[PDB]
């Protein structure tokens, strides 16, 4: 039951601010590339001098 | 460069990773080095979809 009004809860807020579901998946998710991407390769390039 | 993976597409496009690895399986390619690998898979899927 603890399961079930956890993901009430949270599909219900999520409906309501109107955030998808692959947005929150996005924004929390824990898993990462692990390929350098060409915004960190421009912000090193920026960052050094 | 040629560190595209299946795993990493399937993440990426919200796919499930058994489809994705049906269908390259399935299209006989084993590596996505060039858009027709990916444009074969994908029909693949579209289709068994």
Known sequence: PRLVIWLYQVTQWLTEAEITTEAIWLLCTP??????????????????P | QQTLT????????????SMVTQAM????????????????VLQWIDVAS
């Open chain 2, 6 to 17: 299946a795993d990493r597409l399937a993440s990426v496009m919200g796919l499930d990773i």
């Open chain 2, 25 to 40: 399986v399935s299209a006989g390619v084993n590596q996505l080095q060039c858009w027709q690998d990916i444009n074969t």
């Open chain 1, 31 to 48: 898993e990462f590339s692990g390929n350098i991407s060409p915004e960190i390769s421009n912000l090193l390039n920026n960052l050094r």
